[PDB]
Design an enzyme around this catalytic site. Structure first.
Site, short mmCIF file in Angstrom:
data_model
loop_
_atom_site.label_atom_id
_atom_site.label_comp_id
_atom_site.label_asym_id
_atom_site.label_seq_id
_atom_site.Cartn_x
_atom_site.Cartn_y
_atom_site.Cartn_z
N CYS A 1 0.80 -1.18 0.00
CA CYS A 1 0.00 0.00 0.00
C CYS A 1 0.86 1.27 0.00
CB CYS A 1 -0.90 -0.06 1.22
SG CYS A 1 -2.30 -1.19 1.03
C1 LIG Z 1 -1.83 -2.62 1.56
N1 LIG Z 1 -1.34 -3.57 0.81
C2 LIG Z 1 -1.13 -4.59 1.59
C3 LIG Z 1 -0.54 -5.92 1.15
O1 LIG Z 1 0.74 -6.15 1.74
C4 LIG Z 1 1.33 -5.05 2.42
C5 LIG Z 1 1.61 -5.39 3.74
C6 LIG Z 1 1.85 -5.65 4.80
N2 LIG Z 1 -1.47 -4.32 2.81
C7 LIG Z 1 -1.35 -5.23 3.96
C8 LIG Z 1 -1.92 -3.10 2.79
N3 LIG Z 1 -2.35 -2.55 3.89
#
Ligand SMILES: *c1nc(COCC#C)n(C)c1N
Length: 165
Positions: free
Chosen positions: A59
């Protein structure tokens, strides 16, 4: 369309928004706890991206990539939306130096999730926004849409920059 997160498969909730549709305006909350309209008047392209939470590594890379474009393409409006409260959004943006990016919260009305059809259904991530990118033209019409099939993947930046060129 479905979205996968490890062993989980999510139904997307809210209204299906398609390439060729007029993008609906929605109310969001910014870092100053001010209500704002998503759509910007009189800009060539509007990029609207959503992600589950800015707390996550994938993210944050997405947020960092849109922060960089904000400076490289001042003729294009970039917005990043999550269900994170404005307080945490501001804290994470502060720490990472993402100060140019328009970071908006969907917490109050879930109006972005419901009107762009990226609200994650039953599962561990339920009520969070699917990783997604919409590009609107100067009429506010959707000309490009990606809802990322595997939420552990970053968005397709190459497909996106071909739309803005
Ligand atoms: C946004 N993308 C993801 C996937 O992996 C990232 C980590 C940890 N996540 C968890 C968010 N919040």
């Amino acid at each position: 369309q479905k979205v996968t997160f490890k062993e989980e498969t999510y139904q997307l909730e809210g209204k299906a928004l398609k390439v060729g549709d007029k993008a609906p305006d929605v109310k969001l909350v910014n870092g100053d706890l001010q209500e704002v309209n998503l759509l910007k008047q009189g800009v060539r392209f509007q990029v609207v991206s959503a992600l589950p939470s800015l707390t996550g590594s994938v993210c944050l890379l997405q947020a960092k990539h849109f922060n960089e474009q904000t400076g490289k393409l001042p003729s294009v409006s970039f917005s990043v939306i999550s269900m994170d409260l404005p307080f945490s959004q501001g804290q994470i943006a502060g720490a990472e130096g993402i100060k140019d990016l328009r970071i908006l919260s969907d917490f109050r009305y879930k109006a972005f999730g419901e009107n762009y059809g990226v609200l994650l259904g039953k599962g561990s991530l339920q009520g969070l926004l699917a990783r997604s990118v919409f590009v609107l033209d100067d009429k506010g019409v959707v000309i490009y849409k990606e809802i990322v099939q595997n939420i552990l993947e970053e968005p397709n930046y190459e497909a996106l920059l071909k739309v803005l060129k």
